[PDB]
Design a protein around this ligand. Structure first.
Ligand code: HEM
Ligand SMILES: NCCc1c[nH]c2ccc(O)cc12
Length: 456
């Protein structure tokens, strides 16, 4: 039974002067470097416990002792994501209901049914790049986000945002991204009720309405038509929860659709963008991955089967997730009083944060070379100890989109690697922007086409 390590407190400010930054996860990694696998962090009227080792995070992932906490960020996102899967407590009625109803639509097997829709948007990405003039370049996370938004729109509810046809995004996207940005800015806002933010508030409401109006209309149309698709909206209209018997009502179906776009677009765009960043910075890895792409993707359009074959591409992506997990933290609370790690008493309701990039640098698991990009770490992946690698969160509250994201990212990265040679034409210096997720801000490349045609 030990005192918890804690950085220096400054009277009533407590630790807050140490987290004055636009990059707080990177700043908390620097505090973990100094203080170790666990530290308390206090700010006026907030207290939490940052964990960075596999030893402690395994205990935090014990669902009989700890459950998912809604961070202040998630509570602000709940203003438009409602009680959809990401922003609901495990004890809310719609959390288990939607979980039960949606799980089979997110399984590995379900990816067979999404694959042609994913190929549609992936082809649009490849074609856009094939069509660039020789002096142009690619804005990587910008184009990965066009691809992931459009892919979730098509697989989610058979709706085309047509992001590759546009300089300014579809108004739903504009509103979603502006609402997310307002949710995030509220975390930093001294006087949220000051008349200065009256206009923020009005715009937020207007953004919510834009979002609700389109999705409520899509759901209403689909109910009145009676049409059946290979989409999530179909499965939610049909499904019943085996436990309660209850269906999702129309309002919750809307929150789930807003949720899949919010939860899937920026995370999967980040994973693709960091994986390309690492490949252009590690030429021998990029060559190995490109050889696998050419060896495996032998047809003009990839099949579901071929995508499962891209084992090295899968390792590249996991290794990008190891170094910069795009959803870099998740929040837990103690279900009852408990002692963490034999050393640290916690009280019921105490909050723990899992610092994922720091966990993924735990040298007692991964060895000393934790900064090196080496996808071969994952050559044999049942060998990684349980709870050492957690880029999709934990247990029943883990990422429902995991198979979707990884099938998406492997298909797209395999196609990119099949069709282009890539140039880091600016000698780009990694700069990690943190919103509610991580992104390689300003990452740009040039793609020289291999002139390999696409099928129809
Ligand atoms: C590489 C891309 C992704 C990563 C790294 C990621 C990561 C995560 C993590 C870390 C959580 C747990 C959050 C928490 O504990 O507070 C989560 C939850 C969730 N994610 Fe993802 N995700 C990704 C892609 C997606 C996609 C594409 C979708 C939807 C199609 C999605 C949908 C969800 C949903 C609905 C939850 C809430 C699950 C539940 O609590 O029942 N995610 N994700
Ligand atoms: N599905 C992971 C993306 C994700 C996980 N948690 C989140 C919180 C806020 C947000 O915008 C996005 C996310």
């Amino acid at each position: 039974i030990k005192e918890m390590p804690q950085p220096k407190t400054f009277g009533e400010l407590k630790n807050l002067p140490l987290l004055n930054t636009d990059k707080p996860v990177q700043a908390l990694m620097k505090i973990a470097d100094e203080l170790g696998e666990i530290f308390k962090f206090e700010a006026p009227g907030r207290v939490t416990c940052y964990l960075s080792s596999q030893r402690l995070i395994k205990e935090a992932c014990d669902e009989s002792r700890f459950d998912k906490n809604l961070s202040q960020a998630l509570k602000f996102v709940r203003d438009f994501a409602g009680d959809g899967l990401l922003t609901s407590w495990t004890h809310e009625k719609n959390w288990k209901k939607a979980h039960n109803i949606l799980l089979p639509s997110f399984s590995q097997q379900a990816m067979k049914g999404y694959h042609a829709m994913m190929v549609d948007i992936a082809v649009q990405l490849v074609q856009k790049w094939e069509r660039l003039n020789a002096d142009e370049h690619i804005e990587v996370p910008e184009d990965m986000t066009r691809l992931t938004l459009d892919t979730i729109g098509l697989c989610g509810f058979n709706y085309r945002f047509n992001s590759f046809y546009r300089d300014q995004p579809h108004p739903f996207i504009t509103s979603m991204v502006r609402a997310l940005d307002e949710a995030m800015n509220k975390l930093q806002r001294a006087n949220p009720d000051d008349p200065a933010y009256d206009e923020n508030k009005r715009q937020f409401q207007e953004d919510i309405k834009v979002m609700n109006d389109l999705v409520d209309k899509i759901i209403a149309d689909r109910k009145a038509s009676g049409e059946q698709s290979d989409d999530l909206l179909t499965h939610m209209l049909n499904g019943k929860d085996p436990e309660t018997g209850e269906p999702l009502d129309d309002e919750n179906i809307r929150y789930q659709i807003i949720t899949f776009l919010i939860a899937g677009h920026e995370s999967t765009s980040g994973l693709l963008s960091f994986a390309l960043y690492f490949l252009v910075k590690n030429p021998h890895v990029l060559q190995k991955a490109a050889e696998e792409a050419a060896r495996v993707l032998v047809d003009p359009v990839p099949s579901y089967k071929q995508v499962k074959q891209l084992k090295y591409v899968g390792m590249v992506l996991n290794e990008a997730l190891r170094l910069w997990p795009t959803a870099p933290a998740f929040s837990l609370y103690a279900k009852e009083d408990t002692v963490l790690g034999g050393e640290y008493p916690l009280e019921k309701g105490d909050e723990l944060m899992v610092l994922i990039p720091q966990l993924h640098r735990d040298k007692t698991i991964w060895g000393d070379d934790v900064e090196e990009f080496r996808p071969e770490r994952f050559e044999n992946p049942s060998a990684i100890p349980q709870h050492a690698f957690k880029p999709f969160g934990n247990g029943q509250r883990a990422c429902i989109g995991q198979q979707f994201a990884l099938h998406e990212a492997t298909l797209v990265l395999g196609m990119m690697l099949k069709h282009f040679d890539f140039e880091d034409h600016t000698n780009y210096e990694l700069d990690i922007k943190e919103t509610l997720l991580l992104k390689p801000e300003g990452f740009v490349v040039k793609a020289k086409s291999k002139k390999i045609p696409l099928g129809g």
